[PDB]
């Protein structure tokens, strides 16, 4: 649950989802990057239900480096009521990804682990992924 | 209004033809028979009178079909009764009463009018036995476009 602390406004607009990526199209903190190939809203809960799990495969082995942080906090109403008497209280945090962006970064550990670990991790996210080998 | 020859009774003459379905593919040999039955091969064809001739088959047990339609393409039929769906015959109904197989196929490409029903009564299909219409002097059509 990667969330912030101090926010000026608590109710915001749904982010725009069209077009290619902007920044973070490469990998730094480790040899190996997991790219993204479609568009969606990753929603902090995926991240910590696809981080603890990747480390439970990693058995507290090597180290990871996350390349996605949810900023715009999405809101939602509780029980199904009438339409329109205000906005629902914030209940989530979302991050938007576009095709061509490295989401995770790791170092040192063997490529067998890299493949058989990011395949474990992608099985939680609603975006379709593809391996990247730091292919200079 | 002007000058347009209109064929009528006691002015048109019908003949008799004999086609053989030895190496035909049903559908292809059915569309060429429907046109002859409707009489759309004459220069004096009118759509308000019965123009055309009769057709006779002598090999309805030699018809073949490409693909896996011999095991599929089942024929359904209802009897207006709660759960009267009848699909006993499938694609291998060419061994038992194959005359109906071709009959229906050629009767499924004709108009459903009062004149389109009497035009479908000028076709005689036989499983494999020779026709007994030797007093009509039927011409051998065989060859199809």
């Amino acid at each position: 649950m990667l969330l912030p602390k101090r926010v000026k406004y608590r109710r915001q607009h749904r982010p725009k989802t069209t077009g290619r990526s902007k920044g973070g199209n490469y990998v730094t903190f480790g040899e190996f990057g997991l790219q993204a190939t479609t568009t969606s809203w990753i929603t902090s809960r995926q991240i910590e239900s696809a981080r603890i799990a990747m480390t439970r495969y990693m058995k507290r082995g090597g180290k990871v480096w996350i390349k996605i942080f949810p900023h715009t906090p999405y809101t939602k109403k509780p029980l199904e009521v009438r339409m329109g008497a205000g906005k629902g209280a914030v209940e989530g945090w979302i991050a938007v990804v576009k095709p061509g962006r490295i989401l995770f970064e790791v170092a040192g550990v063997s490529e067998e682990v890299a493949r058989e670990a990011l395949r474990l991790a992608s099985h939680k996210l609603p975006v379709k992924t593809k391996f990247v080998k730091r292919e200079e | 209004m002007r000058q347009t020859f209109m064929a009528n009774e006691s002015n048109i003459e019908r003949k008799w033809y004999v086609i053989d379905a030895e190496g035909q593919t049903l559908g292809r040999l059915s569309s060429e028979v429907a046109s002859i039955l409707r009489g759309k091969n004459k220069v004096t064809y009118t759509p308000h009178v019965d123009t055309g001739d009769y057709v006779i088959v002598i090999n309805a047990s030699k018809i073949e079909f490409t693909g896996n339609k011999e095991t599929d393409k089942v024929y359904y039929r209802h009897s207006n009764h709660p759960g009267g769906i009848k699909s006993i015959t499938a694609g291998e109904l060419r061994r038992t009463n194959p005359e109906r197989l071709i009959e229906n196929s050629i009767k499924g490409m004709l108009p459903s009018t009062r004149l389109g029903e009497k035009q479908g009564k000028k076709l005689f299909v036989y499983g494999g036995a020779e026709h007994p219409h030797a007093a009509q002097q039927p011409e051998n059509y065989e060859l199809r476009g």
Binding site: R20, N25, T37, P99, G100 | -
Partner: protein, 93 residues
Amino acid sequence: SLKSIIRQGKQTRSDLKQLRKSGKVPAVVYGYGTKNVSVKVDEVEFIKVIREVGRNGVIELGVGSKTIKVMVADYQFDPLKNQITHIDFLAIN
């Protein structure tokens, strides 16, 4: 590295994406004596840049005249394909 390109054509309609599956890339030399007088290169002779320079050094050009050492500097890597578009050189003077 002896790699040769040629002067390609401008006034391009964007109908080139489809003449692009068949290999090419743009390329434009910087430096005096000439200008941004672009050159067109192909890829599967760059399937062997592996041994050519590394990334920092010399390449022949054979670009008609003024065939000297020219340096491909920038990077215009492309997402979603493992393709490449507009890699470009410069003169050494």
